[PDB]
Design a protein around this ligand. Sequence first.
Ligand code: HEC
Length: 104
Amino acid sequence: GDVEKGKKIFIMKCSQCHTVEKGGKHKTGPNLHGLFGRKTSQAPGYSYTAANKNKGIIWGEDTLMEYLENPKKYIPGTKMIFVGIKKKEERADLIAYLKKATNE
Ligand code: HEC
């Protein structure tokens, strides 16, 4: 739940493909601002896969905990090529950071 540690994980693991700031660029992956409490596939201006659109979950602490352990198990056919993060506490820290930064 540690936002300082989660920021560092974001930078190392995610930041090459994602921005989190309001109005931030889409890059390889979508800008993530506003995601908490949204369905998948909601960022206008981004080309998602049908797999992502068809997942039909709401993004939130628990769903992101599962997704980020193993993205392709959670959303088969996703084009996010990221193997996932093993440690539950590392995912928890990252998600706390995302919950701060994507709501800012
Ligand atoms: C490129 C190598 C990426 C890295 C590293 C990470 N992500 Fe990603 N993400 C990427 C793409 C190309 C996509 C679109 C996938 C699709 O099938 O359309 C995504 C998607 C996400 C999502 C879902 C976004 C939404 O539904 O609106 C999330 C929540 C997400 N990515 C988060 C995320 C995090 C936290 C990362 C670090 C652990 C991370 N991704 C790495 C590309 C890439």
